[PDB]
Symmetry: C3
Subunit: 188 residues, 3 copies
Amino acid sequence: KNNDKLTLWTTPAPSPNCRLNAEKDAKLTLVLTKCGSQILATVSVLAVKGSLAPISGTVQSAHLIIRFDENGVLLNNSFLDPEYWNFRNGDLTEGTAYTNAVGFMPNLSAYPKSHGKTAKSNIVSQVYLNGDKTKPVTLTITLNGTQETGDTTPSAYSMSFSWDWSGHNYINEIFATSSYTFSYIAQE
Amino acid sequence: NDKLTLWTTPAPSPNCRLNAEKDAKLTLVLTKCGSQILATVSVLAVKGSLAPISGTVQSAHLIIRFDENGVLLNNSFLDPEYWNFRNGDLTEGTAYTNAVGFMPNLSAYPKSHGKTAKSNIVSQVYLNGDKTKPVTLTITLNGTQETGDTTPSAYSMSFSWDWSGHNYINEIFATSSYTFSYIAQE
Amino acid sequence: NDKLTLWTTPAPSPNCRLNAEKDAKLTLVLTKCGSQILATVSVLAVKGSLAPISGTVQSAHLIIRFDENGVLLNNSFLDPEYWNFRNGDLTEGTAYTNAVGFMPNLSAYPKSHGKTAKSNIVSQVYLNGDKTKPVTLTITLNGTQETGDTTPSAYSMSFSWDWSGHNYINEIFATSSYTFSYIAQE
Ligand SMILES: [Mg+2]
């Protein structure tokens, strides 16, 4: 059992695995590492096709919402593909889908279902396009909720990533973000 | 039951004093990862001049002080009732007698060396989780980013929120969650 | 011993080269949390053109390089004497022979892909812990954001501090503490 039940990830070098505008138009690298009562996370994203590859016209943001059921399992019609979202085995994922990941879900006491507009449910910081300090992008992570254009979409748990560069002209650049570290309180 | 997390609980009642007793809810979670502590912090004001922000208020400050065993001092500006080791989403019932493993390391962050760069963690957080409303957070370990706090303590953690130059009048003072780490005493 | 933390010690003597040998004190602590390393970094210059900042100086750079076993190369710009696994507030005296579990993952951060966004962590730190004195810190894993470091290594970690546009002349170069994490090789 080369398994590691304390890390849930996309793999460190994913194939296209998520939908920012269309199916598999980006590679999300997301690693969740369980440190008891807190999850330690790293996230980065790279667009591979469409209006973010390269950034065209008037687009100044990108959004991904990941939704899980009561067992911490991705919902049907997930915008993150489930095939390579699993517990760690070396640099790969287990092949058999997990049945329970509640230990990696954002705590519902800390981050209640209807509370996405609450300050505590948001982690907000700058990341940098192409790892370039002169090209800031704001990242807003929302736990068990959304601040955007209205979400009472059923899920038990959720994690929302919103990248925004209002005011910046990044036309003809590929949308790709520096790696960002964060933590949140675990459900169990 | 979990002796590797010391917290306020994830959903505290008013539990700290920014300008008067119990005028805010501090959510502070400390998770021991051996030689480093992994921490998350958020604050929400519930009454007074921060709820909502009034007049000329452009900052808020909290100092938490501990004794040599890592126990909150008397006259604490963080209420000790629900500051304890984790049990579910609650605290253990019996007050802890030792948390030295969660205290900021005195070799790394010496007592009253708060003006030293290394004893400070400084970053932007965001009012109401709103990217257009930045607030600077300065965290100081075993000191204050200022001349002497003269109340003795073995260890301390100081939080200073500042929004000089911004007009947030009539907004409730509430901060996005912020992750940091620091070197543990043992 | 504590084989889950690799560090400079929490209060190092001068131990790294920004512009000359031992012209700075780097505090760097790496704590293994399975698949991720939790890190804290701070730097303090002690002599030369950064102590205090003089003339035209608006940046500082350090590259740390390791072999296939995770051991510092010869001609290291971080001194190997006090870079080791934790023993109290000190280091083990006998040099480590393997630290591959602390190295940046090659699948995530491929060798010489320093211009790739994912291999960079970028944020503001603050001179003297002062919120009015920002400094950008760019961390690069297994590469350098300034291209083509030509010195071969199995693994590397690059730190670039930049304050273009700011006049910090006559200040000592000293940074607030900064937390980050990265995917571990094993
Ligand atoms: Mg910033």
